[PDB]
Structure formats: C-alpha cells, structure tokens
Symmetry: C2
Subunit: 327 residues, 2 copies
C-alpha cells in the first residue's frame, strides 16, 4: 500500500511537493488543504482540494501531512495544530524561534503519538547536516556557509513592500574572493559584508523617486544595511523575461586540520534551477522517514539530526548495504 500524503498550502512549495510525489511511486497525494475556498485553487494533478478546517476529518486517510506554509505566520500555528492529528513535515526556517517551535510541535506530537519532522529542506536541512558532519569529523577547524547565487523570496518581498516599488527580484550572491579564500584553506575571518553581495532588480511605480527607493533599499535594517547592495530599475517585461526563475544554491565548507597539521576540506554544494522544487523533493523524502518511524511506534518532534538516512529510502536496509555502501 502507498504512503498517503496530504499537502497544506499550495504555493510554490506545495506545487513542488505535488511534482515530487510524481517521482516517488511509493507515494500518493490524497488531498490538498488551503485557507482559500477550495474552488479558487487549481491543482494540477486534480486531487481533491479542501479547506483546512476539514482536515481533522481526514485523520485516517493520510499517513503524512507535509506542511508547505511560511514560517513567519503559517507554521507557528499549523505545526502544532496538525501534529495533533497527523505525522507532519515542515520547512520551518526561523532561527531565533526554532527552540520554541520545536518544543511546541513536540508537545503536540508526544500527546498524539505522531511523528513530526521540522525544519526540513536544504537550509535548514541538508546544509545543517553538513555543518554538523564537518564539525564532528574535523573538530579543529572552521565552518563557512554561503547561499546563492539565487533568488531570495524574503529579500524580494522586502523590496516590494517599499512604496514606490511595483515589483522586484533580489539575488543573493557569494562573493568570489571570499569563497576562494575559504576553499584554499586559509581559514579566513569574514564579516557579513565580505561573504555575500546583494543585487536587486526593481520595477518602479508611477511617480516614484528612484533615489528614495534606492536609499530605502540600501539602508533597510536586517535585509540590506550590512551588505554591498546594487539596485537596477527595469520594466515589468524585463523582470518577467529575465527574472522569473527561482534558481538557488550554495555550499557548506569545513576546513580543518589533523592533529599533525594536515589541511583537510569538506564541501557540500548545491546548484538548483528550482529552489522550491528541490526543497519540496526533500520534504517528500523525509515524509517517508516520518512514516517508517511512526510505523515503529516512534513519536514526538525530530529534526534532520535525528533521522538516519536509511529511513529516507524506499529500498530495504539490505539493498542499501549491497548497492551503495561502496563502489
């Protein structure tokens, strides 16, 4: 029998999960859940769409609910809410709130006897795994994480909420000189501004003051005041033509030394033409783990740090040992 997946939220992430389920034949999409009236949400695979208030009635129809919502508002409620009725996966990515979200999700999942895996994706998720690995395998050394080149939704949206901006896309861009110094094993000390540049393409509103927009962008706290930021005004057509993708990538590098002074370097890198399609394929892999864990009577909140990779595969442990352990 197939692992029965439900999706909450049908944004780029939910649409990404639906596509990943197409590539995971042990799985089937039973339902999509939305805040919206169902009738307004056109699901490509033509599965039933339903309102989230109905979801509790599907407790016995779904093995794993993959929560596709944002972290600022959707997850803080949805994580604990759905953990009461299903095993869940989410992409929660808010640094300062992780301990609280975890405790919250965990309390509900313990209560319900369900498995919740939070903060899955590539960062957090894959990259977090690699920060950890770097640090345990090479305890004397330094970890560097770089993001990009690619489109940051959050920074794009930040620019767009400026009055005077009609639309925008921002690229987060590792600065080469900084990545080469890391790669070449110099173990540099690097400030925020030395690691990433930011590059913005902006479509002005009628009557805007460019200089004022540029100024609000470059002096915005958190988003841009710590980085070299460039701004470029272009038309809507240009924004659609050249900046419609959601590529991204990055790398986690650990550079350390043996106790006899040998320079050792670990690098895990990603180069994605679709960020949300990637993130969502990870979500679905982890759903498999949540299921197998649930099936062995496990429960509670987990992160990627608690999940053995074998559980992510449909292949049996024997076949993994046979096929992938070496050569």
């Amino acid at each position: 029998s197939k692992i029965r997946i439900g999706i909450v939220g049908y944004g780029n992430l939910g649409r990404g999960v639906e596509a990943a389920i197409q590539q995971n034949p042990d799985m089937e999409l039973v339902a999509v859940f939305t805040r919206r009236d169902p009738k307004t949400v056109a699901v490509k695979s033509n599965v039933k769409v339903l309102h989230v208030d109905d979801a509790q009635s599907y407790k016995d129809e779904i093995d794993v609910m993959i929560l596709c919502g944002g972290s600022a508002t959707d997850l803080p409620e949805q994580g604990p809410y759905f953990a009461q009725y299903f095993n869940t996966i989410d992409s929660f990515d808010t640094h300062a709130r992780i301990p609280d979200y975890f405790d919250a999700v965990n309390a509900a999942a313990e209560q319900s006897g369900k498995v919740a895996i939070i903060s899955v994706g590539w960062d957090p998720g894959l990259f977090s795994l690699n920060r950890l690995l770097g640090e345990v395998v090479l305890p004397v050394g330094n970890t560097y994480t770089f993001w990009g080149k690619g489109v940051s939704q959050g920074h794009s949206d930040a620019i767009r909420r400026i009055q005077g901006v009609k639309n925008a896309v921002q690229y987060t861009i590792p600065i080469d000189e900084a990545v080469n110094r890391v790669r070449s094993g110099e173990n540099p000390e690097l400030s925020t501004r030395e690691k990433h540049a930011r590059e913005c393409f902006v479509v002005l509103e009628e009557g805007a003051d460019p200089a004022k927009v540029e100024h609000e962008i470059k002096t915005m706290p958190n988003y841009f005041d710590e980085y070299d930021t460039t701004v470029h005004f272009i038309s809507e057509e240009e924004l659609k033509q050249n900046h419609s993708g959601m590529p991204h990538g990055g790398f986690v590098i650990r550079s350390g030394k043996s106790d006899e002074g040998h320079k050792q370097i670990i690098e895990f890198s990603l180069n994605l033409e679709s960020n949300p399609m990637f993130t969502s394929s990870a979500l679905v892999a982890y759903a498999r783990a949540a299921y197998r864990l649930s099936q062995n009577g496990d429960k509670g909140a987990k992160t990627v740090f608690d999940i053995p990779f074998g559980l992510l595969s449909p292949k049996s442990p024997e076949d993994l040992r046979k096929e992938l352990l070496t050569r």
Copy 2:
C-alpha cells in the same frame, strides 16, 4: 567520564585514530593492541601496548574498540572476534563481502549485546551517505563517484609485488573532461576508462627489464587493464622526496531533474592532505555514536545508513538545534 577507546592495529590508520583522539576531549585512548610483540610498537602518546590475545581481559576497561586493520584479512576475523566483547567501529571496504561481513559481525554483536558500526570512513562512509541522499532527494537522475587525485595504497602495493619493482606509488586521478560533463548536468554515460586515469611512479630493482615491468603494470587485471595508465621510473630518493604524502579526495555528484525539467545538482567533495588522518577522524566520531547507541540499550551491527548525525556530536540535541539547524 571520558569515552574509553581502544585501538587494534597501529599502522597509518591506528596512528590516525590516536591523533584524532587528541582532538576529541570527551575521549581517552586506554590501550593499543597489536599482533606484534608490544615492545616493538612505539606508540607516540605512550599509552600501553598489548597483544591482541590479551584484549578480552580488557572488556570492562574499554567503551569502544576501533579496529584499524585492512579488510582483505585482518577484519574478516577481527570484526566478529572483537564484537563478542566490545562495541566496535571498522573501515571494512570490500564491496563483494559486505553482506557476509555485516551478517558475521551482526551475529556476534547481537549475541553479545554490543554495537558494531562497520565500513566507516570516507568511502565507504561519508560518500556512501551522499550517494544515498542524492538518490532519495533527486530520484530521477544519475549518481557519479570519483576518487582522487590521490594515492591509492592498494594499487601502489600491487605494483610493488611485481618482481623488478623495489617500490612504488600510484595516483588515482579523475579525468577532468569526465568530471565537467558530470558537473554541467549532461548526465553522460561513462565507462571505467573515461572516469579515472592512473599514474605510477616506480623505483626499479637492480637488473630489471623496464618494458616488462611496464607491461605487467598496464595489463594487470582489476588494478590497471581497464584504465589509461602511465608509468614513470624514478629513484628512491625522488620517491621519498616527492611521493611521501598520503593525499586523497574526490566527490559524489547527483544530477537530476524536477518533474518539470529543472536541472538540480548535489555535490559532496573532499580534498585531503592526509587520507588516513581523515578516515580515522571519522572513525572516532562514529565511536561516539556507537557508545551512545550502546548506552541506550541498542545492539547489533550498523552502517552509516543507521546512524543519525546527532549521535556523532558531543553537544546535546538541544544545542545542535539551537546552533546548527540554521544561519
């Protein structure tokens, strides 16, 4: 209380473990065990050296025994032998024997209620993890593993067993063109001969026939006949001067696609100035896991596929969530 480690075999690996223990303050090396008379084995940290026949008398003195022997003959007996009396880690790397070694070690570890983790290292080990990850995150695409540039002990030793060769060192070397094709997402079909070249430096015995040595090297089954192989005869002094390191490295790459055609690429790469120092730094990380698993009543044999990364850290699960989960 420190985690109490014993080492069996004091070649490059065991000496690597000793160095890694210096970098892991939750650990202490209690004993080295050898086949040799102990008096012939000079341990740099001046820990006691003992004969392997003694080791059983040490079961209540050691938490984890890290087996540093070769896979061709030491491990196939040592794995099951020591798994009767301790938790063990090993680097078993013989593809075709893994299912049998696993079964053998597992039987003993189950019987004794001990935890054995086999085939740890960078390949197998880290790279195997990344083959697995690639494949579950990106189910539609291709995995490629390359090794080097670096010194392969096995191929060096194979050249040295030729009559007429006094000594040698061989380098396994990713062929650039093949790696670029993989990196650029072409998903090429690649033969053995297309992925790696082999490069040999050879110090002839007095009286040797160079042409004949060269011919035996290049037509040797398994080691060289499937590859473009070059041979270079040099002196002993040059071999000491320029070919004394044990560097190595490589990468595992998955190139896949979203169900909508987006090209996605995962790469995990290593660049090591000391292969054995690296491999042994991993063994010691995993020893930590073996101990935790032991302490929670777990038992039986494991591979890296069964070990959650969290268990490899000395930091609590809480501190890992806080610190490494993002940013």
